[PDB]
């Protein structure tokens, strides 16, 4: 048995580690694009990581979604504003999959300070779930994440992911009901509608157990 | 791991502090935009701040849409009336952004009064809610809106969480029903209707469990 | 034998003193925050223990839930509210946690006085019972709690920290019988709903044995 | 009889022992990867067993949970906090498996001083069996665990067992009564609930004899 038929035999499973690599984060070929906008608008190579770490945090109490507007500028850059930032991250990869690669150094960091998502109130979350109210909180346990060095203060409960896994649902299922079905946005097809449906009809509710 | 892929070890999560900012409350540049105009139209800058609290306590009252008429002239101005505070304010951002800026500050403005929003009745809250009766409540836990010095009085309990959740779905289910699908308002379009919907097609209801 | 797997000789059992820390009890650094906001509010530093003395046993005749409203001011303030000093207790660790750090304390204080909790018969407790009808009543003999310095007069019997456990299982379920199991407040999940259940079908008993 | 059919003789049970090991208590592979970072994050080596004493201790006044919330700082590190000590086991075994491991010792330095788990009277523990109130105490007569030189003070009494049984029942069905039975986290089948269950349907009951 050789070729794509060998059977291992103990040695592989012992010696070899897979490099886990997720097409959900941003890529190490992503990151390095955003290294080279980055430096050449200006931001310091001293603090590159603290800038993009500024960035994701601020990506949690608004959204990760590439119509966000962000607000103002972090203390790691030289003044580049946070929309700048974001701008060139959307030439390369997704906002959320940039996001989604800090997202358990966001989670530390929002657990040390006790600092929950800014608009956990507005979004729904009960406030024994608060901490779970981001989108790319997914992230906090993908191994192609960054992982801070000593390890996540308290992983996620099963609540949090329950709550999170809800208004992900929430979320999602209402912005495709401001979407259409429409193939194509020619006005032959789409007849001047936006949704093509009316108030009543896109109304979105999760059905009961 | 350098660049964007150095790992963060403990002294980050220690001393940083992310000053919160949020797109869902008027910004610090919004905020400084306000001033300006307030001080040419001749606001006292000694009650600069009680002007803007009496108008988003009179704002919990009456609603704070863009199309809101403001009523009268708040104690704190030099004889300048509500709706020109407002108008000024809608040049830079929303009124709602606004209000949920100073959402705190009136939140415990209207627990230490025992004085619910006006219109709580109206809106068809029970009287159990009716504290939760104003639009811009979900800014009271927002960090990016001004809490009071020594903290909410009370904080929402659950129950006023999902009856103002229930009543954001009404109205804005109820607005949107008043409004068109119709992705331009030329007549070509629009073919002359309003909402482009009978009455019964246009009834809004909450599906029940 | 070093390391994590040293073996411990009996020097280290005669000799070591573990300082007692709970998380059910307010920690040293919330009652340094709690010290530093009460006397910027001016509580008087000569009487600042008085004052949280007498905030605690006025707890123990209302609850020490979140939503609780303090009536009056003590004795120990310089006039200010056992409402204001709550609420600045609520911006650091909650009222509950910082009533089982002077639980001993106020044990104390009752039993001197013969003075039980003021609605122990409307919380279904016996007469025999009635000083054990406070929450953080499982705080008197944590010793992370204030003991005071000659000791408690009485220990709890054990009927009543029977008739305590009893009363703690009535009010929590009571208590979640009103709030829901939705992981979302949002009206998509809620349909409008407060506790997502019938009047009958909430009705908490203990079963008989 | 050779291969797997040899019959044992009186030489193999005089001469051989077995090194206990256990699946329930941290492995010695687990304790090496637990002093690399120890030591990464600058925790001393000639104090690096009474660190983990001490944070062993301190755990058995709180939970040894994923979720428990750590403290503060014992006088063994060089200042680094009981919650970073933490957050670092888990990353290799449960933090409970690891103490687990230093059971009999913690057992031992609480008999000694007199001092029992500090939450015993709101785990509903009777004076009497108030010392088998921490979880993990069924590690003290586990051999593979850390055992003091001179042996245990004083073995657990078969009513501190009986306790220690019956409270592990409550608080693990407790526990499993505000977990679910979803099989996946996803909306599509938990319907936005977090326990699928009435407060009503959730009451644990240990049924009488």
């Known amino acids: 048995a050789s070729g794509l038929f060998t059977i291992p035999d103990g040695d592989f499973f012992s010696t070899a580690r897979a490099i886990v690599a997720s097409n959900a984060v941003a890529t190490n070929e992503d990151l ?22 500024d960035l994701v945090r601020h990506c949690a109490d608004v959204g990760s ?7 103002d500028t972090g203390p790691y850059s030289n003044g580049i504003s946070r929309a700048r930032l974001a701008a060139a991250i959307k030439e390369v ?3 959320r999959q940039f996001c989604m690669k800090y997202a358990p150094v ?10 929950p998502p800014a608009n956990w109130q507005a979004q729904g979350f009960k406030p024994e779930h608060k901490f779970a109210a ?7 346990t993908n191994p192609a994440a960054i992982m801070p060095k000593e390890g996540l203060i308290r992983p996620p409960s099963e609540a ?9 649902f929430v979320k999602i299922t209402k912005a495709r009901a401001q979407s259409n079905d429409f193939a194509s946005l020619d006005a032959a097809v789409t007849r001047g509608r936006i949704t093509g449906t009316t108030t009543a009809e896109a109304v979105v509710t999760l059905p009961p157990p």
Not at 40 to 51: L, Y
Not at 107 to 114: A, K, P, V, Y
Request: include cysteine.
């Open 65 to 71: 979604s590439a119509q966000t507007e962000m607000i």
């Open 32 to 53: 390095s694009k955003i290294e080279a906008i980055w430096k050449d608008m200006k931001v310091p190579t001293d603090t590159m990581a603290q800038a993009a770490w």
């Open 134 to 140: 981001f989108d790319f909180f997914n992230g906090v």
């Open 106 to 115: 966001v989670w530390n960091w929002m657990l040390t300070n006790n600092s």
């Open 160 to 168: 949090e992911m329950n709550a999170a896994q809800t208004a992900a």
């Open 93 to 95: 990869c997704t906002l």
